[PDB]
Design a binder for these strands. Structure first.
Lengths: 103, 78, 97, 95, 93, 105, 97, 83
DNA sequence: CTCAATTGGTCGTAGACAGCTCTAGCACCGCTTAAACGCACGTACGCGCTGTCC
DNA sequence: AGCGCGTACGTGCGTTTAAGCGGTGCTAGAGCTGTCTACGACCAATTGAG
């Protein structure tokens, strides 16, 4: 196996397959799918880590879309990456503006 | 049909949106804007459906329509 | 007693930002969808999942619109959002021309 | 019957690598699969355009690199660049 | 150095549209940019449409639906009429 | 006629469009009608724009379309403005528009 | 002597610049600024004069659009013109950071 | 040569002219500073992208093309320079 | 349970990549004066409210 | 939100700056072209991960 050869969980083979079939270029150098799989596993790790931490915060045995939305919107960088993304069953962050609250 | 988007439903949404106080005129405005929105999204989705020669609009058609609109939705396949 | 008007509103905001389930009744939205699509093509079918996805996108869009509008109102120093606020919002977004 | 492929298993494996405790709901798993596909799309698209901008035929690991540096926020890009360099060096350390 | 540009084609068009009217160098430039832009947008959309249909042979139909997606409805309608007319002529030729 | 721009009755280079569609990796294969259709739509859009911009030039009493005129055309037509709403045109400037609030009473 | 009333000249100016299309920022200042910022990213980068002018066209059109949105934010209670709160609002409505 | 303070090359009258084309009648003296700020952030983003393209090209010259690509990637497509 | 991932190998060419120049982008002076600065000034529109409306 | 308050920033002007022109020098690396082969695509035969 190649992900073995690279220490990856994500399927280097299937990433190479998708890069080939996706017509992204005439040729896809063998280093490219390894690198992309690694990036796609550092991402995903990032967010699944934050979602599991949120699940601990929310005292849950399972990540539910709430936890993903919370993780994504609390992390300023993921919220930059995903600002034009919406997530099923995610809801929204607590947002009340100062003039709406009573003095 | 359009009035099926009840006043309480719109209140609930605006509350999720953090709206404290609502002019009643907001309800028909919301209905109009939501109609326009749906119009555009469904038109794109059907246009994929038409191209696929399907009669069934699929979840993928909706996803791809939203991906066009800049509204990328996770939850139904990418 | 009487809750001073506006005190339940914040409570409801707190609930509905805690909650994440969809807030429009499913069938009425579905029927509005079928109506709008009929205008474009006859004898259409929808996957239930496709209708739910439409509803998700529609609700999250509306929530973000309400947020922005609220901010416009606050800039108006108004607690009450108004059609002119939605208009300004969308205009700045460049949705409406 | 329809054997629809997904990254599900790899998402679960990575979850258990970050959190051996807890699981992930099928809904959140679907959202993760979506997110994976989206990021893959964005990166491969960027690398495609980088290649055409250089008239180059081959999307190399370097195209992916620069794509990641354009697309992701600076810190997230930084760490992603570290991870990709590490992974490519590991792969080229095996055959 | 053999830089391709739509300059000649755009000229021809303008000679249809206002032969008495010239296009400035920069205006021509902009039109070139626009043409390339819309080309890339339509072709990319046709590509994604092709992917969604697992079709590896972008036909005129993929272009048609892409145009219906990208252009606003009246501009789209006219573009469709023009495209189908041109394809009809080419088919008869 | 030999060209595919002929037979199509088009000024735009059907063969060039076909080449670009192949060269751009937009697909593995590009059916011969697709280049014609794309080329025709290209032509139509260029024509529509050059029409509006030439009219603006004429009412500017100028024979040469300059970026001023392209921007004026593109923003005066709501549909072109929607197609080009995110586009910036070098040296285009803005439509003359002053908010009525600002005007003296 | 002669004095235009306040904003008379300002309106005449707006009319003027909406008639014209030249670059409103003085070029060489802008070029130096660009060089400075780029130096923060990478030393020893040469800028095609065209590439500079392109950055300038983009910056000007972007800021003009922003000012448009900001002036639209003026609208409530027949409030007039623009303040930094307006800028911040307009940007956030755009979703800019 | 180290470059500094060139942000001040955005002269108050320049920002005024821009506000005029933008249809602003009256401009808060505060806007000029915030406007320099916003411009700086914007330039930062576009320049970062163009630089990244030059780095991929291994080119030591930032070209107009690289800025155009940056702006298109920014979703702000610029016509007049190629691309 | 099975067909997508996998390997060693060949092919041939993409692009490494090294040289080669001369494009045009670097500095540079230096004179002109449009524009920047800064100061005065003031008036109009940003601040305020409690009148009042639901 | 009418109307009061008031001092902010518009119109002006006089002075100072340096942007612009443009004229001139220099050079480095943009881009071209020519040589080689590292490389990715194709392939048959192989395996077990999803």
């Amino acid at each position: 196996t190649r992900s073995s050869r690279a220490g990856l969980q994500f399927p280097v083979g299937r990433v190479h397959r998708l890069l080939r079939k996706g017509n992204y270029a005439e040729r896809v150098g063998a280093g490219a799918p390894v690198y992309l799989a690694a990036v796609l596993e550092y991402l995903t790790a990032e967010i699944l880590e934050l979602a599991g931490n949120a699940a601990r915060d929310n005292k849950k045995t399972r990540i539910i879309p709430r936890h993903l939305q919370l993780a994504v919107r609390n992390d300023e960088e993921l919220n930059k990456l995903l600002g034009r993304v919406t997530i099923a069953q995610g809801g929204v962050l607590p947002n009340i503006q100062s003039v709406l609250l009573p003095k | 049909n359009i009035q099926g988007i009840t006043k309480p439903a719109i209140r609930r949404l605006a509350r999720r949106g953090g709206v404290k106080r609502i002019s009643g005129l907001i309800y028909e405005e919301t209905r109009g804007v939501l109609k326009v929105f749906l119009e555009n999204v469904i038109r794109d989705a059907v246009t994929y459906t038409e191209h696929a020669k399907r009669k069934t609009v699929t979840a993928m058609d909706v996803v791809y329509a939203l991906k066009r609109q800049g509204r990328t939705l996770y939850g139904f396949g990418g | 007693h009487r809750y001073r008007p506006g005190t339940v509103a914040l409570r409801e905001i707190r609930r509905y930002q805690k909650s994440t389930e969809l807030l429009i009744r499913k069938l009425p939205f579905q029927r509005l969808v079928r109506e709008i699509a009929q205008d474009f093509k006859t004898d259409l079918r929808f996957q239930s999942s496709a209708v739910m996805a439409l509803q998700e996108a529609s609700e999250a869009y509306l929530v973000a619109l309400f947020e922005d509008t609220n901010l416009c109102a606050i800039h108006a120093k108004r607690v009450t959002i108004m059609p002119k606020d939605i208009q300004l919002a969308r205009r700045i977004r460049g949705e409406r021309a | 019957k329809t054997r629809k492929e997904s990254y599900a298993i790899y998402v679960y494996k990575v979850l258990k690598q970050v959190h051996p405790d807890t699981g992930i709901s099928s809904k959140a798993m679907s959202i993760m699969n979506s997110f994976v596909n989206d990021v893959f799309e964005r990166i491969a698209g960027e690398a495609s355009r980088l290649a055409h901008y250089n008239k180059r035929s081959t999307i190399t690991s370097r195209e992916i690199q620069t794509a990641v540096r354009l697309l992701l926020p600076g810190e997230l890009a930084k760490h992603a660049v570290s991870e990709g360099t590490k992974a490519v060096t590991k792969y080229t350390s095996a055959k």
